[PDB]
Design a protein around this ligand. Structure first.
Ligand SMILES: *[C@@H]1O[C@H](CO)[C@@H](O[C@@H]2O[C@H](CO)[C@@H](O[C@@H]3O[C@H](CO)[C@@H](O)[C@H](O)[C@@H]3O)[C@H](O)[C@H]2NC(C)=O)[C@H](O)[C@H]1NC(C)=O
Ligand SMILES: *[C@@H]1O[C@H](CO)[C@@H](O[C@@H]2O[C@H](CO)[C@@H](O[C@@H]3O[C@H](CO)[C@@H](O)[C@H](O)[C@@H]3O)[C@H](O)[C@H]2NC(C)=O)[C@H](O)[C@H]1NC(C)=O
Ligand SMILES: *[C@@H]1O[C@H](CO)[C@@H](O[C@@H]2O[C@H](CO)[C@@H](O)[C@H](O)[C@H]2NC(C)=O)[C@H](O)[C@H]1NC(C)=O
Ligand SMILES: *[C@@H]1O[C@H](CO)[C@@H](O[C@@H]2O[C@H](CO)[C@@H](O)[C@H](O)[C@H]2NC(C)=O)[C@H](O)[C@H]1NC(C)=O
Ligand SMILES: *[C@@H]1O[C@H](CO)[C@@H](O[C@@H]2O[C@H](CO)[C@@H](O)[C@H](O)[C@H]2NC(C)=O)[C@H](O)[C@H]1NC(C)=O
Ligand SMILES: *[C@@H]1O[C@H](CO)[C@@H](O)[C@H](O)[C@H]1NC(C)=O
Lengths: 614, 126
């Protein structure tokens, strides 16, 4: 299990910019512009444009509030008039340079519209968002705009009994089948297009009730799925339906410890400036006995692609003679491959679209959407497993250290408004710091990263507002030792400026900078006076930031024992000399000790010169 | 004078439908459709099969796309009189249906040229 966050930053001790509109709640949708300087917020009954560099600067505002006759219609359907019967923005996507595509629950009448960016006024397109947007603010939902066409995963109805992964195309509308083999009680988590003869694919991530597994209760299972951008459906069968829909198990577990995380919470696509293949960073929690635990598994796209392209499918079979069981299909697979895209191979066999695929192949995919092979993580284990924390959303920044060693920086939000910064150091997790983003411990519902030159920020939304944080707080570190010991690839010590700087931001010289991810503060170069009355009591204040260090006191060059009657420890860090007399005068030193590898790192926290009067 | 029985040769009967209007009876049989008077007088006969078929294949059954197509008999799956037409669904070709003129069983009104999965009506198996 991952250790405790090395340093805890109170909302008070760091520079965090906040945004909220009075009487406006549920800041669940976040979208930043092309230029990255304008962040758009989708809340309950409102859409805003804020300066992404200072979220507190409100630029534009637009509302989409529900009428009383629509609220009462919703309430008459036994829903909560002042809770669920309101317009929760669920779809906030780029449409053009001059517009956004917006959908809201709208007292259970999913409605879509175009937000005119030049005016920040809605165009009144008033489209029926049934299938595109959920009815209930409680229902799961995911959407990705690909080539001005919305690819959405949510419920097709009011009750949330009909799930749907569909494309609102207008030219070629396509949707999933309303069948258990296709989708079995899913809870949508994330979707994105993975761009390139070879066609683009639109991946979907969700948790659904498993068909392959049987246990005491119904077992959930994380799913990775994909569809082909060029899909047009089948001609005779799969009319207006996906022909390219294949899914597989997403497995996040440490078995030598019986830890299985079968509930997917978030998915982030690490788009490597260097690496040609994207890495999905997926966030999971266990369905069973969650108390709570969180795990972060990283999946190489190539792995998943290997399953969808060459993996054996699963067959459903009748078993004695009213039951259905699912097993590996070892029978003959049709050609062209069921679920495959219109690639170079297909085009050679005179196949231009799904509309001209053989009925043999189309029937196969319709009856075999599920793959036998699981999609496994890189190094076949989670990147991080944490206890006593319920992680909510994830973002990852691939950063180059001073050394040139590349670290994948994990920003993980909690259900209590906190953000953890973690890196997988040499075969062990290091949680650099934790920051309390929300003073009200509101769970971070959404998280969004901008790693772009200048505007390097993380944006977190909750029901109470939005928070803007940098990727590091290098300046909070006082000494070179403190700067190095942090083991943050973002932070380096600058001897000329006598400040711990943010490497890859500051205008300090690279060649003349200090950073050691080993934590060996050895690479570094290197008195509060008091006058108290006789008989009186002294409180010598001492504090440090490491949650992984312990402090001890020293008087007259010896390790002082804070025991009654002469001594006491107030708050485990502040020394208390009780009965002051001639001999108590002199130097009192507060020291810290923290283990890095095998070695211990002692640091002098406080220096005190106590003088007792006569 | 009028028949007291109807015993078609070289077939088995599946369904009967009476036209409330005219009294006309229609009979759904293996590879046959019959139109009888209310007095059981045979008025019209329509062939419904055998056809090249396979439950694994979709209509229109093309030999090049369905090499396992073999001659199949066509027991009547559904036979109902509607105000406009006689509704006819077979066991063959995925349970596809058609509409025939009432009183002119021979006259086809509607039989979709190229049907899709959403038009496979009846059980494709007797
Ligand atoms: C994600 O999965 C892909 C799929 O294989 C990984 O890519 C491949 O990794 C192998 C392993 O070495 C590469 O093979 C060889 O690399 C050595 C190293 O220099 C080279 O000397 C050999 O001649 C050969 O190239 C293979 O080329 C490479 N292919 C691609 C497209 O990347 C990828 O590394 C995985 N990424 C992660 C983070 O797991
Ligand atoms: C949108 O944001 C608002 C802002 O907090 C959320 O409001 C909160 O709603 C919950 C109920 O869902 C309130 O909890 C209470 O639950 C008990 C259990 O029965 C009930 O008896 C109480 O009357 C109350 O409803 C919570 O107090 C309330 N917060 C505030 C400040 O009023 C709202 O739930 C969010 N909606 C979504 C879909 O996230
Ligand atoms: C989007 O909003 C802009 C903002 O007004 C609209 O711009 C006006 O467009 C009309 C022509 O249609 C011009 O005559 C006005 O002078 C424009 N005013 C401004 C301030 O630019 C634009 O038309 C809107 N687009 C749509 C589709 O409604
Ligand atoms: C969602 O589907 C609707 C259904 O057609 C799309 O609506 C058409 O939109 C185009 C402009 O993009 C208009 O020119 C057509 O006249 C519209 N037709 C109808 C019936 O609405 C809509 O654009 C789709 N939206 C997205 C984001 O894909
Ligand atoms: C982690 O999240 C779980 C829920 O997923 C929390 O468990 C709930 O805690 C509340 C607090 O009293 C209880 O009323 C609920 O009955 C609990 N539900 C379940 C299923 O246990 C858990 O406390 C959270 N723990 C941490 C460390 O975040
Ligand atoms: C932007 O941030 C600065 C930093 O303190 C603040 O002074 C300024 O008022 C903020 N702008 C707005 C509109 O809040």
């Amino acid at each position: 299990f991952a250790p405790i966050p090395r340093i805890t930053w109170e909302h008070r001790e760091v520079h965090l910019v906040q945004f909220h509109e009075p009487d406006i709640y549920n800041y669940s949708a976040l979208l930043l512009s092309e230029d990255k300087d304008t962040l758009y917020i989708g809340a309950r009954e409102a859409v805003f444009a804020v300066n992404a560099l200072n979220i507190s600067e409100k630029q534009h505002e637009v509302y989409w509030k529900v009428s009383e006759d629509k609220k009462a219609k919703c309430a008459e359907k036994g829903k909560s008039k002042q809770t669920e019967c309101l317009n929760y923005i669920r779809v906030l996507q780029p449409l053009s340079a001059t517009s956004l595509y917006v959908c809201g629950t709208n007292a259970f009448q999913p409605a879509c519209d175009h937000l005119n960016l030049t005016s920040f006024k809605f165009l009144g397109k008033n489209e029926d968002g049934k299938g595109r947007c959920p009815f209930d603010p409680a229902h799961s939902y995911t959407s990705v705009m690909v080539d001005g066409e919305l690819y959405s995963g949510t419920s097709y109805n009011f009750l949330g009994s009909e799930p749907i992964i569909s494309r609102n195309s207008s030219h070629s509308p396509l949707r999933t089948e309303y069948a258990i083999p296709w989708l079995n009680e899913p809870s949508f988590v994330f979707a994105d297009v993975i761009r390139k003869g070879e066609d683009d694919r639109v991946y979907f991530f969700f948790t659904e009730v498993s068909v392959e597994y049987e246990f005491v209760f119904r077992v959930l299972i994380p799913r990775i799925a994909r569809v082909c951008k060029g899909d047009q459906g089948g001609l005779r069968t799969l009319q207006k339906k996906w022909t390219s829909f294949l899914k597989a198990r997403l497995i996040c577990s440490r078995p030598d410890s019986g830890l299985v995380f079968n509930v997917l919470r978030d998915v982030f696509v690490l788009r490597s400036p260097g690496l040609k293949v994207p890495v999905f960073y997926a966030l999971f929690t266990p369905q069973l006995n969650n108390v709570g635990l969180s795990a972060v598994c990283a999946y190489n796209l190539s792995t998943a692609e290997e399953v969808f392209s060459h993996g054996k499918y699963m067959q459903s079979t009748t078993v004695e003679q009213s039951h259905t069981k699912w097993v590996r299909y070892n029978g003959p697979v049709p050609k062209p491959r069921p679920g495959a895209c219109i690639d170079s191979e297909a085009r050679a066999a005179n196949y231009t679209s799904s509309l001209n695929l053989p009925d043999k192949t189309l029937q196969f995919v319709k009856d075999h959407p599920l793959m036998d092979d699981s999609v496994t993580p890189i190094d076949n284990r989670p990147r991080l497993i944490k206890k006593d924390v319920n992680y909510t959303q994830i973002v990852v920044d691939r950063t180059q250290a001073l050394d040139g060693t590349v670290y994948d920086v994990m920003f993980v939000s909690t259900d209590r408004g906190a953000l953890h910064k973690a890196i997988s150091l040499e075969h062990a997790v290091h949680i650099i710091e934790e920051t309390q983003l929300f003073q009200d411990f509101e769970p971070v519902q959404t998280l969004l990263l901008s790693s772009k030159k200048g505007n390097r920020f993380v944006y977190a939304g909750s029901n109470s507002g939005v928070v803007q944080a940098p990727l590091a707080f290098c300046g909070k570190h006082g000494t070179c030792e403190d700067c190095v010991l942090a083991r943050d690839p973002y932070c380096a010590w600058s001897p000329p400026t006598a400040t711990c700087v943010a490497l890859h931001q500051t205008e300090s010289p690279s060649r003349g900078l200090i950073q050691e991810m080993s934590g060996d503060a050895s690479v570094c170069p290197d008195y509060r006076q008091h006058f108290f009355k006789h008989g009186g009591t002294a409180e010598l204040k001492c504090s440090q930031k490491s949650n992984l260090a312990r402090v001890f006191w020293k008087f007259q060059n010896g390790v002082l024992k804070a025991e009654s009657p002469k001594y006491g420890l107030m708050g485990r860090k502040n020394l208390l000399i009780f009965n002051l007399s001639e001999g108590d005068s002199g130097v009192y030193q507060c020291l810290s000790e923290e283990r890095v590898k095998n070695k211990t790192v002692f640091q002098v926290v406080a220096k005190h010169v106590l003088e007792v009067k006569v | 004078l009028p028949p007291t029985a109807f015993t078609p040769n070289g077939t088995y009967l599946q369904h009967l439908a009476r036209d409330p209007t005219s009294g006309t009876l229609y009979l759904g049989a293996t590879n046959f459709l019959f139109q009888l008077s209310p007095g059981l007088q045979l008025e019209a006969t329509v062939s419904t099969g055998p056809v090249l078929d396979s439950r694994d294949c979709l209509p229109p059954v093309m030999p090049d796309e369905c090499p396992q197509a073999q001659p199949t008999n066509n027991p009547n799956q559904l036979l109902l009189v509607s105000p406009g037409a006689l509704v006819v669904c077979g066991s063959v070709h995925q349970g596809v249906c058609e509409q025939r003129r009432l009183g002119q069983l021979e006259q086809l009104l509607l039989r979709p040229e190229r049907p899709g999965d959403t038009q496979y009506v009846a059980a494709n198996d007797p």
